[PDB]
Design a protein around this ligand. Structure first.
Ligand SMILES: O=c1[nH]cc(-c2ccccc2-c2ccccc2)c(=O)[nH]1
Ligand SMILES: O=c1[nH]cc(-c2ccccc2-c2ccccc2)c(=O)[nH]1
Lengths: 158, 156
């Protein structure tokens, strides 16, 4: 139970049997970290459509099916709006990922995921993604580097 | 996590009710609580839980199930508390009042959280869903949680 208005975001992870696709954020907020593909959900699209849109804007990739794998709520200290991130997964993709102004994509082997160069929360919830366990997460950050509080639980329904 | 002291906490958890005890004196007096305390040299953690349950409620138990581990840090106090949380449905006997604890059943929709340790509001949901967990709580005095973490786990 997290009270107050929340802004919808998506995050997509292309997770294949032996590898995961990440993008190096090139500009803006969180520039310099590897990340899934995502952003704010817009007025007039569904959450899944927002996810597809962000993936295609940032990597050129289109997808057959996206699967809901988690929801993460973020509080940032001093910022009034909570973020409600819907996390999606796909295995099969259509096309080869291409570099955008926002993101430089690369494939990573599942034992070489660069956690020290990713958002701190990823170290906690990525293992659940890898083990195919649906989850709800909560992280309170102070700035970009410090997790002050967090909760993580497995769920039946995302 | 640096240096720490082992503690147990036991929740008798039945389908419609949970047995708590009102702590009659000493530390945390006036709060409803699970049963437990310090683990002694030469006993296992579960044997200490069983011991404390019996001393405080009169109850003996068929099986105790590991539900979680919670680490407590109190600002000022140097040593951490490493609390092992246990659960049990089937019990042996009536609970009875002791010098440390007056037991009382509470219906699951009337758990008196405002008269319990504030951390209980956070981790009881996982207890009640039969999930296992690792928790951490930083306290300033007896009322104030400064920060915490709580992660569902597969093994305690
Ligand atoms: O793995 C991640 N965790 C958190 C963030 C993040 C941190 C701060 C602000 C916004 C986000 C954000 C942006 C877009 C889509 C989802 C989340 C992130 O980018 N990636
Ligand atoms: O539900 C609870 N949460 C925290 C405490 C607690 C708080 C402060 C000091 C010690 C404890 C303690 C005592 C004995 C056994 C385990 C924990 C508690 O008693 N009960």
């Amino acid at each position: 139970s997290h009270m107050g208005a929340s802004r919808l975001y998506t995050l997509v992870l292309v997770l294949q049997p032996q590898r995961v696709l990440l993008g190096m954020k090139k500009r803006g907020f969180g520039a310099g970290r590897w990340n899934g593909f995502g952003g704010k959900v817009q007025e007039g699209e569904t959450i899944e459509d927002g996810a597809r849109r962000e993936l295609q804007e940032e990597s050129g990739l289109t997808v057959d099916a996206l699967h809901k794998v988690g929801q993460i709520v973020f509080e940032f200290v001093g910022e009034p709006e909570l973020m409600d991130v819907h996390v999606f997964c796909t295995d099969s993709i259509q096309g080869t990922p291409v570099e955008s102004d926002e993101m430089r994509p690369c494939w990573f082997q599942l034992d070489q995921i660069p956690f020290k160069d990713m958002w701190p929360d990823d170290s906690y919830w990525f293992p659940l993604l890898l083990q195919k366990k649906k989850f709800h997460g909560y992280f309170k950050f102070q700035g970009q580097d410090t997790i002050l509080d967090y909760t993580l639980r497995e769920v039946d329904t995302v």
